[PDB]
C-alpha cells in the first residue's frame, strides 16, 4: 500500500566544454519512468516505462521546458557554489538534487523530500516540516539565508503537498497492472568443497523484486553472524535482483544449517537447507 515518486537531478561541470551536463531521472515507486539528458541530440524528457506513453504531447513539451529551466538553474548554481567554496577554475564539480513525496497505503502524503548535494556532499535540505532548512557547511549558510529570506520553502512545500502527490496518483492509476508487482524470491543452496573437512554453503536468492531482501543462516540454533559472507544486492539486468550469503560448515554436519529469506511478496520467510 505505500507509494512514492522521486526525481534525481544531476549537473556535472568538467574542464570540458563551456557548459554543464544536466540529467534528470524520475521514479515512481522506485522504478525509472521518465528521463531528460542535456547531452541528447534533441534534449527532451522521454518516457522510460511503457505505461507513460499515455501522456500526450502537451505533457512532454511542458516537462521538457521545466527541464531546460532546471538546467539553467543548475548552471547558475554551479557558478555560485564555485565562489562560495573559493574553488578556482579547472576542476570537475557536481551538483545533485533529490525531491519528491511518499504516500502511505492510504495514498495520503506521508512526507516530502527536497535535498541538495555538492561534490557528493550534503549541501542543504528541506526539513520534514517543509518549513525549515538544514545546511551544515559554513559555505551553505549563504544559500540558507538567501532561501530563507525569499520564501523558497513555501514554494517547494506547495509542490510537495500538491503536484507531487496529485500527479503520483495519476501515475499510479495509469500503471496499476505494471507496477503493482513484487517478483518473489526463488532460493536454492549450493555446496562448495573447501579446506579439508570444511565446506562452504551458499544461499542464493534470484529473480526477486523490489531489491530489498535479507538473508540469514540459522545454524538453527537461533543465531549466526559468525563471519557470514554475503554480497550487495545486484541487478540481474532483467528487472530482478540477486543476492547470496554463505557460511563455512563442517562437511557432513550440514543439514542443521538453515537459511532464511525474508522478502516482501512472500507469504512467510523462506526456509531452506541443502538438497542434492
Amino acid at each position: 500500500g505505500p507509494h512514492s515518486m522521486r526525481y534525481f537531478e544531476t549537473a556535472v561541470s568538467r574542464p570540458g566544454l563551456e557548459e554543464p551536463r544536466y540529467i534528470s531521472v524520475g521514479y515512481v515507486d522506485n522504478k525509472e519512468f521518465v528521463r531528460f539528458d542535456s547531452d541528447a541530440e534533441n534534449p527532451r524528457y522521454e518516457p522510460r516505462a511503457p505505461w507513460m506513453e499515455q501522456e500526450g504531447p502537451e505533457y512532454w513539451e511542458r516537462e521538457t521546458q521545466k527541464a531546460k529551466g532546471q538546467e539553467q538553474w543548475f548552471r547558475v548554481s554551479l557558478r555560485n557554489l564555485l565562489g562560495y567554496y573559493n574553488q578556482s577554475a579547472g576542476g570537475s564539480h557536481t551538483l545533485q538534487q533529490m525531491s519528491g513525496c511518499d504516500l502511505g497505503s492510504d495514498w495520503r502524503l506521508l512526507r516530502g523530500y527536497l535535498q541538495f548535494a555538492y561534490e557528493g556532499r550534503d549541501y542543504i535540505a528541506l526539513n520534514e516540516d517543509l518549513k525549515t532548512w538544514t545546511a551544515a557547511d559554513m559555505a551553505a549558510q549563504i544559500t540558507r539565508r538567501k532561501w530563507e529570506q525569499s520564501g523558497a520553502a513555501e514554494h517547494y512545500k506547495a509542490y510537495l503537498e500538491g503536484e507531487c502527490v496529485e500527479w503520483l496518483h495519476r501515475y499510479l492509476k495509469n500503471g496499476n497492472a505494471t507496477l503493482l508487482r513484487t517478483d518473489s524470491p526463488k532460493a536454492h543452496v549450493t555446496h562448495h568443497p573447501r579446506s579439508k573437512g570444511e565446506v562452504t554453503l551458499r544461499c542464493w536468492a534470484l529473480g526477486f523484486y523490489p531489491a530489498d531482501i535479507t538473508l540469514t543462516w540459522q545454524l538453527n540454533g537461533e543465531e549466526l553472524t559468525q563471519d557470514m559472507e554475503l554480497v550487495e544486492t545486484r541487478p540481474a539486468g532483467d528487472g530482478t535482483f540477486q543476492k547470496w550469503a554463505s557460511v563455512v560448515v563442517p562437511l557432513g554436519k550440514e543439514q542443521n544449517y538453515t537459511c532464511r529469506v525474508y522478502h516482501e511478496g512472500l507469504p512467510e520467510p523462506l526456509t531452506l537447507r541443502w538438497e542434492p
Binding site: 526525481y7 524528457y45 529551466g69 548554481s77 544559500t143 532561501w147 525569499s150
Partner: peptide, 9 residues
C-alpha cells in the same frame, strides 16, 4: 510532475 526550483543557490 517535476519540481521547479525557486531561488538559485
Amino acid at each position: 510532475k517535476a519540481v521547479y526550483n525557486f531561488a538559485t543557490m
